[PDB]
Amino acid sequence: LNVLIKDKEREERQARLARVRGGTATGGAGKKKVKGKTNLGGAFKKDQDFDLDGPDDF
């Protein structure tokens, strides 16, 4: 049931911030920005040095 609650709130949160053009509710008035996520890959879990260095960058 708790998972149901969490998922439902997630879907509703999509709906409210559909109308509002930018980031968080109230937009540019808000003073609070919308955060993003760091795509780490698998680099830093149980942190160490990286044996697999990348030769070239797209």
Binding site: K33, K35, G36, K37, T38
Partner: protein, 55 residues
């Protein structure tokens, strides 16, 4: 240049430093201050015979 990326864990600062090549400058100093270049003298043979060209 310096930037603050706002992730969900906290702020990620991003510094970028770029050293441009002094040769491609076209405005101001073309080299570092202590770069010295001596130009190679073009080497020619000794004459060993005195002559006068005339006109």
């Amino acid at each position: 240049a310096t930037r603050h990326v706002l992730m969900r864990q906290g702020v990620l600062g991003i510094k970028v430093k770029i050293m441009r090549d002094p040769a491609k400058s076209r405005t101001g100093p073309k080299a570092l201050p202590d770069a010295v270049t001596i130009i190679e003298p073009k080497e020619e043979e000794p004459i060993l015979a005195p002559s006068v060209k005339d006109y």
